[PDB]
Design a protein around this ligand. Sequence first.
Ligand SMILES: O=C(NCc1ccc(S(=O)(=O)c2ccccc2)cc1)c1cnc2n[nH]cc2c1
Ligand SMILES: O=C(NCc1ccc(S(=O)(=O)c2ccccc2)cc1)c1cnc2n[nH]cc2c1
Lengths: 472, 471
Amino acid sequence: EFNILLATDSYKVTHYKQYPPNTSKVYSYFECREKKKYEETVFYGLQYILNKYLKGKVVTKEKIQEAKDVYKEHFQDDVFNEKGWNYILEKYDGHLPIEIKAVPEGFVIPRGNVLFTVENTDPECYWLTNWIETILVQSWYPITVATNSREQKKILAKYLLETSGNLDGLEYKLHDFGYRGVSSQETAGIGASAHLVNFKGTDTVAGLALIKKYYGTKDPVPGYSVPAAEHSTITAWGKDHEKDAFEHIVTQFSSVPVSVVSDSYDIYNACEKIWGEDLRHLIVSRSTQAPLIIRPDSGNPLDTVLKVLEILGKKFPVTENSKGYKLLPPYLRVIQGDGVDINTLQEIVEGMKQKMWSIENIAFGSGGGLLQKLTRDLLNCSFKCSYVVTNGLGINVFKDPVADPNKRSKKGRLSLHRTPAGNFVTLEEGKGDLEEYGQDLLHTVFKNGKVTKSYSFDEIRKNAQLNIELEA
Amino acid sequence: EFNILLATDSYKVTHYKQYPPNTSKVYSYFECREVKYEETVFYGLQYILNKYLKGKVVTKEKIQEAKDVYKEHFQDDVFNEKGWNYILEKYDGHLPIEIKAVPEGFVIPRGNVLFTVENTDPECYWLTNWIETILVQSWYPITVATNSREQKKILAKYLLETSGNLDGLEYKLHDFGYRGVSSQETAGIGASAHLVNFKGTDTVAGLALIKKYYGTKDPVPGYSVPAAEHSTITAWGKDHEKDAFEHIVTQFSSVPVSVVSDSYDIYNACEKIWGEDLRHLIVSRSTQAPLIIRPDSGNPLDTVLKVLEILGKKFPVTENSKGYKLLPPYLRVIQGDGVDINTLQEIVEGMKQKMWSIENIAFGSGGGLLQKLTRDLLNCSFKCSYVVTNGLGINVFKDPVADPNKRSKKGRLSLHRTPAGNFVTLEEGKGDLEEYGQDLLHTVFKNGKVTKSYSFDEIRKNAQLNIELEA
Ligand SMILES: O=C(NCc1ccc(S(=O)(=O)c2ccccc2)cc1)c1cnc2n[nH]cc2c1
Ligand SMILES: O=C(NCc1ccc(S(=O)(=O)c2ccccc2)cc1)c1cnc2n[nH]cc2c1
């Protein structure tokens, strides 16, 4: 069983001895700090943390004893606020005396804004606010996944709209291939959920159960997939029988979409001779609802996509859509599932546009780039104390390191507001209380061990919509 | 509860329908194919076997749940309920799979077989690659352990050069990554991988992982000491940084204590607060209880060098037997910002150029140590090499025209010692020729049971540096 007393950075175990004496309140906040191409961030993932780790009876006498035993050895010393944790167990039946206020999940907010705040609701527990920094700060991950994935949707939407005149199929244009390429099962479920904020295609099955249990959708499931080959299911036929494997596979899955990896030996041969001649009669007969999706998986991503499109365009009948771009027949599409990240995604669609290929021809699969190749530095996700009450006097506190202004933190009690032009501003020094802006956009989501305000996955998807989708 | 029927890539649910008819065996292997990372530490498969693969992993409830989920996920019924029922009925839900693997902690050059997977029942030919996804997650502990060991090699080189010994090495790179990884589970796994090489960690989650899955003779495998954060300094108010420092070092007067010193002005803090106002409370400390000053901002090399220069003018520096400058034993520095393998190398080299011993410094690394890593670094990859269809074995492989680096190995594999004492991977069942002695892989899982396992102490021993072996 998870133990909250063992889920912090070692050194925070020692912080209750370090705050000013006579401190009754420690108030802290999280922001994606501005760095003076990710100017706004999707806030998503805190509700998972709240429910899985923070709510309810999270302190027991056994958990207190276990932590005591581990820390004695880990520090070779007895430092460990047993009394403080006992107090929570005795007075509040092990529920955390904490209040967290947060912008609504799905909200899209420019950098350098307060996204959530954390404070203790009992003076005895001034040390508890920053105890839970470590676990709360892991929110960086679903925020960053959701944000990076939304930025890739923006690129796709722009190029799809330019080359086709509409957004049809956008929500299936970046599929999650990341299950194997992330660091753990738990990471899998959280990352795949964050991607589904923006798209509907996933092979990372772990995300589905996460969303059902912590967020929920009207629909049975949040994300979808279709049958597809891997190198094993082709190479197992023998080097001389790739055509046999292709023929068997597309015939097995004759009435649904099916994607077939085509680069086991020579992708260009497979497209031109195997699909484009030997097995062509099995492809041209397919339903628009059941295309063959050819998948290259090696070579320079851009050069390979362009050469595969050139090959297919000569073996299959291509049309020119109303915007002037070339379009494969509806029973044939391509997915590039190797080497995709936000930078290469952009290079490919721009490359396709230069060569007059519509983005309606293509979809992308991304694994490590989507779910693993991200860090807390990308959006400068950071948690800092801004306000403390000592001797009954509040003071506004901050860091401001001389050699890096970008690390200066905000001061005092914070609130998030709509500006007169309809943007966002964070008010410092308790200035929200002056009521010169509308209401504070942070809402209490957790208080004294109970989750107080929750969002469905459907609402979150609504909140994270692109401006061009809204315009449609 | 974890469900192995729901822990694979979606498309693998459909693979049972795509292998050649009459296939009875699918045999697959994992390798790290191909800043140089020429050799990898194999670590973390044992966690996965125990936590996810062993024992009764299939129930009637788990089958029905998978069934229900895939029906919606595919908008169709493609799930192999019959195949999964066969496991439940025939084997009480234990996986009929055999996995052979090199010993954990082993340090093996790139491009060698590390583990192999095959079904032990012909009906379960499809199961070998169902569990690709979960097994390939081993890339993460391997890669963390490996990059952490590469950093240890750098620190050893320079500590040996500037001090004449390796005293302190195992505490020179501390894990600060708990908040910077993608999840709790990731925290425990990657912290454990770093502890293969070092003993300093703040990522508490690794301690219970190691105790449950590997074990150590010692009560715990990793340690920490008291330290401030910005909140415990800034809470005193901007004009009271001195007061905060004094309170903290007096609270922790007889154990090591680290104090972040750049909340406002790191160079002021070192020269005037520590070096003048509070100097009398630092020069009185025990060798066993130093103050460890922590910068946390600015250019990491420039800041370390200026911090050491400031301190060397306020405190009595000696010159050790190698000609390098050393702080008094009650004073040390830790650089815990911007540290990855590249900046770690830049800092130690810049210290060496300025005649500072590496004894003076320790490093903390978070995102750089535990999160800034992918499966592409070591090219961790799982592929089928051998299948039996209609009773005939065939050697199979991929060989993409545009990328020879992605070519995979062929046939039944085994791992051998060469006449010169190195590793070689034999393909095509050639290990059976008996020209290169015994297979170095061991059966670690068979039919639901873990059959061979390693303590964390053995793993640490296997993972030692050659410089460490030398004296
Ligand atoms: O093909 C794979 N999964 C199946 C798959 C996934 C996505 C598509 S798609 O073209 O985006 C598509 C998605 C939804 C509906 C129609 C078409 C088609 C097939 C696949 C392929 N390679 C992978 N490596 N790692 C995980 C992987 C998953
Ligand atoms: O200082 C921190 N942790 C305590 C700590 C860690 C490491 C050392 S050390 O100087 O390497 C040391 C380790 C072991 C024994 C003696 C000295 C001293 C203190 C710390 C500081 N910043 C952090 N950010 N994220 C996690 C963090 C942890």
